[PDB]
């Protein structure tokens, strides 16, 4: 099985070679990756990083951007995951197909994120913060990334406190999603590399 909701279905046709399964899968997830790159180009200051650092941030942070953008695929009340086909699959069914604690952790992440009740605008700025906060292990000019991060983080703090003046904790709760996203990325990357 292919229990990733980026696929059209978790069912894998056994008559297909491994190379054919992955090419089909790549046709499904590539458009989401390309949308992350276009989003990155619209972040003020992102195009000013060196091209090496731009690619490394996207390499390390694309999954976490998509995790934020696709949090709505996880219906925390019904316990279903919407795959790219639009068809919903239950937690129980995915657990029979081998999905595990990672899936459960994606449910908890999406539940807590949805509960913050962010506007589209704050969600968009949070997503830029998520991208520019990606693992800096490759990065050549860490100071420029750190400066871009602080700029976006400062703007997010101001937007949040402007829009949620008596719920000061929201900003802290948003910052606490970054280690959670990073752990989702660490685990997911393991499962991904095991598949191939």
């Amino acid at each position: 099985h292919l229990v990733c909701p980026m696929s059209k279905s978790p069912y894998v046709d056994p008559h297909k070679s491994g190379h054919e399964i992955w090419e089909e899968f790549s046709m499904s997830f590539t458009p989401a990756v390309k949308e992350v790159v276009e989003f990155a180009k619209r972040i003020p200051g992102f195009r000013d990083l060196s091209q090496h650092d731009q690619v490394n941030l996207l390499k390390a942070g694309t999954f976490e951007v998509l995790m934020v953008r696709f949090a709505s695929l996880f219906d925390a009340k019904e316990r279903t995951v919407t795959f790219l086909s639009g068809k919903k699959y239950s937690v129980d069914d995915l657990h029979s197909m081998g999905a595990g604690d990672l899936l459960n952790s994606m449910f908890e992440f999406s539940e807590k994120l949805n509960a913050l009740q962010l506007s589209d605008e704050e969600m968009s700025l949070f997503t830029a913060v998520v991208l520019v906060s990606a693992d800096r292990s490759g990065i050549e000019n860490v100071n420029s990334v750190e400066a871009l991060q602080e700029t976006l983080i400062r703007a997010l703090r101001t937007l949040i406190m402007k829009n949620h003046p008596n719920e000061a904790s929201i900003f802290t709760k948003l910052l606490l999603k970054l280690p959670d996203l990073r752990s989702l990325n660490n685990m997911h990357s393991e499962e991904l590399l095991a598949f191939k």
């Binding site: 990756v33 390309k34 790159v37 990155a40 180009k41 091209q51 690619v55 996207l58 390499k59 694309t62």
Partner: peptide
């Protein structure tokens, strides 16, 4: 492979 998709989309 992810990186190739990224670089291709980034320069386009």
């Amino acid at each position: 492979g992810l990186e190739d998709i990224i670089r291709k989309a980034l320069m386009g």
